[model samples]
Target: EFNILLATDSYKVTHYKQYPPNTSKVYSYFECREKKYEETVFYGLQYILNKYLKGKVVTKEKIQEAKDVYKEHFQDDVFNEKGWNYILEKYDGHLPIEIKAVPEGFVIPRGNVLFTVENTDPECYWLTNWIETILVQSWYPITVATNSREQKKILAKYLLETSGNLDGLEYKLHDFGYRGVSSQETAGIGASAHLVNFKGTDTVAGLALIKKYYGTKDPVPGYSVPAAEHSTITAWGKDHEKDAFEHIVTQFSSVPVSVVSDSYDIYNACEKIWGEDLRHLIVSRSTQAPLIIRPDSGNPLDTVLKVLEILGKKFPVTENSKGYKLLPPYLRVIQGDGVDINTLQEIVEGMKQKMWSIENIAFGSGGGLLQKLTRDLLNCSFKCSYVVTNGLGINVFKDPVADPNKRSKKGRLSLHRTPAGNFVTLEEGKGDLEEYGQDLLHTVFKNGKVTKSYSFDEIRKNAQLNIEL
Candidate 1:
């Protein structure tokens, strides 16, 4: 029942009859108009293409199903049954379309073209925008990738200032967003976007997605360790909290693990049970792997600072080259509650003010990482830019007077990098395709076949930050 023909806006069923007579071609492009972050990390196109738009998507059964639904849906015979049948007979169910896009994981400035779509056969010009409803969904993954990259910028800056090097940066931010997203598909796509920046995640679907689509045989592309939740601790009687902590520490002594310490009282659990009672066990385990403590309640800044203060007293604290206090190798803190970009900045700044190194802390986010965003976060849009009719091509665009931000580009377009290394989008077929550098917009897909593919390692390298202390 997964019919590609039915995966469009209901109104698009009548679009074939609305195009101008002899309309032979239609060209459209996708872009981000948000200035909040001037650049976007393009990603997730391969997953969408492989999952939905790849070989032989249109079928006779799907066409008839769409025809029946549209007739009953609009209470009229408005569906273009002939147009769909012509595609089935002439092209053998493969869609007649071409997709050109920037390479996945490349970071391009906002308000620029990210991808373009057009009809390969003149008879299927209306099919260009017919797929708009699904293609525009690329915004979800793009927005998630952009958000993660922005957070990475902040994390890298503080790490360089405090730690004096970028050691252990990939494990600083972990994904705990599996249950927060709307669907498993969202979790997979959104978490994979974050993985382009970091290698820590708890979303199993994300790891599976990377293995299936991005061709990583590593099985655990996004790595995580055993971690405790509220229920595991709360299930232990409050009077026996110390026993529960001891059992967890002893069981995972040789491996790194996270334990939620706020079941009864966060301060007492850290100061007395872990710092005093289990201090020797932690030190013994420090020789193998670190024990990470998680605080799930209270103001993130205040709680983290207090936890660090208590732990510094029980264990030895060393001063880094930057003169900030650092935790011992076997112990750390993870602030998994009340974290977003703004609050993360606040907590890091708070630690800096008190002479603490960023190396002592890590972060885990659920809603903040995958769910707390929208398509408007990047102002993503797709619009028609050119069309051909009767052997003549015409530039198409819209400039609504109500809002200048809605203005769109016109004509057959190409993205280029100048000799001086600046990005520019040339429009109206005026670009020097041969003289200028090779167009960044390569034909990634044509006639239902994928022409380009990228692996997980390649995408990670492309999205890596080029920062210096």
Candidate 2:
């Protein structure tokens, strides 16, 4: 039966190794291509080792399944039975993959090797050598974390400048990327990545992943406000928009809640509806929590400026030590549309022109927070750098004539942070790593077992460390 065959023939069971010599021990390096951030958001290595490979041993049934899949998929006797036999007999079904990685939250520079890997056994080289195609799937969280971290740095700079301190920077940018991302898993993973820098999010899947992988239940790592979408307001009917706004504030005002002002007319809602009619209702709940006005349409920068101007007229503006105008504590705006790194830059630059403190508004990103990026966005690449064949070690490279940009690293790699805190990639063998300052890479996994694991809190602290206050 198909089910019977399927039970025996899982896809990974058919993991066909193609390249690299049978006796080869290959070393591979993973790094980002361009300078996307001041420091990298090194992550996902722990997830890859612990979740993907730990304790997964080859069994007779797995071999039988691999045989069945090889018969069906390849239809050739060329299935590497020798390799499978060696794995079953010597590896006891476990993979020989070994991974050494930078700390999950340590901030490293672009182009510095984030991790390195090789097959632990020379015979098992066919088992896990040259595994970049699969292991590089870690690019998701690493890239997302870097993007999120850079966004945080942008927000932090402005917050420090305008607020004269890091007040309310956690909610400076909120993650609305759950729906915009490719999948629920992506939502959770990317959202959790964003939390390394800020503490606000709407991605529940990310929170779930954090809870499951990082371990926590009470007082979640990320928080979000009760917020309205177009559906909630549109369902309220255009004429009853005031009623809908009032209802949202009264119901969710015990804590902060966001109301989408642009559902009907963004300016009318901000000026006539919120500024004039609902002023008393909004102000009454101000002491309890802030009412977040979401201007979700048109140009984010102009829309934000308009919304802030209208809110300033209605609510009292307070001057901070820098003499910049900030909307009173209870009033704030969230510009969610067209909100990306470039748009955020425009918003802050324009706000400087208006003499408005960045405190008056926070930003929310949907696609830009997760879906708008690619592995190449950070120029992420993983490639074999060295190989030992028949006891002869050779440094390898891909010096492409097509483009020098595609050129890869060479030799056995060990990344270290110098005493000055700069990175140095060394030719570390079974030799001492202590000679180089602190070895940036730690052995997270070896021969199918997890050697080390870090808590999410520890990771967050590590990520926050390199961020200059």
Candidate 3:
């Protein structure tokens, strides 16, 4: 019903701007009383006459007549006789949207191509050129987020081992990437995809994600957490065992939890005084919520066996026997501080002999994974392959592959995996110039208007449930 146009004002370099109906153009389609067809016809067609007329009268021919008249009046006026530099690249069989993605953040080979994009209309090659500039630029955060996940995984494993407990993690997987990303929209999408692998992310890509994929919402009654994921409450050296342990509980009352019982002396503290009141408080309160105690600095596996011996004995096999039968699943002992893959292996191996339930631990990770990858490493900038203009055309889009270490994947690419089922990048290929790449992330919107509707929770749920790995 509306012919949408894309263009901007001629503001030298990069002048910030806001859209229509927000400017002086509010009265643009108006003219006083010297009307040919009621100058204020636009004020609202369904006014006084329509209310009384109801179903008795139907559609009017005058509505159809407005198209030509309105078009003629704005011919050289507000209709933009000249388009902006960026928009011109998209007109007249030119410009295409090229993108390289494995839906953001799924790891692939260092040099292997992951995705490709190009003109849906072969004649509009120049559009690809414009796409390139922002392509890699847009892809960097995903690389950062994915790498963040990898490091977080390592940290999670280590902490569990440190606590003498064995379990995999995942906490508030908030993407703090916005503070470092180039654009709000980009940060939102990239972070949304990144959070999919973990439990939560700060950037709320919920709205966009849902609209894009028919995403679903979580069944949880409440949503959103107050803090960043894995953000820790640290206590230093002398404060190790008793002081640190006491302070953590005094401060975090919401945590029906456990603590770093090895501070003053792991042997005496963990062995002698670990349970007492702490065990009762945790076991009893945990009947209702998630409260795991965490420590921030130590290689967990080194003494996991001994630590477990004490924690295990604290919960005596009563009439109910091995009371996990009635204990709330989310509360338990968690460890942290310099744990890694080897540490995890140690914990797992040790737990087998003592009949310990390895699942009773949680993890929080920091520097171990958050900072290794940089913007340069992720290739955040991107550009299109080509652009067409006039009756003639221009191929501005560059490259044609998803080289791992580059600006962004070039050309229109479709990603297919190995026949044997590999979660990591085993193999892939550029999508043929014929079809859209997997039809996942694309311009569901044209002319900058959303053509669909969705809720944010839907996207979060989809991210939570849908990763091949």
Candidate topping lDDT = 1
Mark the regions of model 3 whose C-alpha exceeds 4 Å error after superposition: 1-137, 144-194, 200-255, 258-268, 276-283, 289-291, 303-305, 317-331, 339-356, 374-441, 449-469
| Tens-digit per-residue lDDT, 1-469, candidate 2 | 1211233223433444545454467678788865336567887767656555677555667667667766877666545667767867886766787888888888788777888888887776644432455577778889888888887788888777877887777778889888799887678778888887888888888877777677544569988778998888889887999999988888886898889988879999988988899988777766548898988898878888887888788778888889899886777788888888888988988887888998888889999988998887778888777777778888888987988888887787778767796886676352254687666688888887988888888888788833353
Models sorted by lDDT, best on top: 1, 2, 3
**lDDT (CA) for every model shown?**
0.89, 0.77, 0.37
Cα error of candidate 2 at position 88, Å = 3.3
Could you give me the TM-score of model 1 versus the true structure?
0.97
Model 3 poorest ten-residue lDDT run: 26-35
Candidate 2: regions farther than 4 A off: 1-22, 34-38, 75-77, 216-218, 428-435, 465-469
The collision pairs in model 1 are none
After TM-score superposition, what is the CA distance of residue 439 in candidate 2 from its true location, in Å?
Answer: 2.2
Taking every candidate in turn, the Cα RMSD to the unseen true structure, in Å, is 1.4, 3.4, 16.1
Error of 1 at 428 (Å): 0.6
| Highest TM-score scorer | 1
TM-score of every candidate relative to the true structure: 0.97, 0.91, 0.48
List, residue by residue over 11-40, the lDDT tens digit for candidate 1: 888899999999999999999974468889
Q: Candidate 1: lDDT of 324?
A: 98
Show pairs that collide, candidate 2.
33-379, 57-93, 58-93, 188-205, 188-206
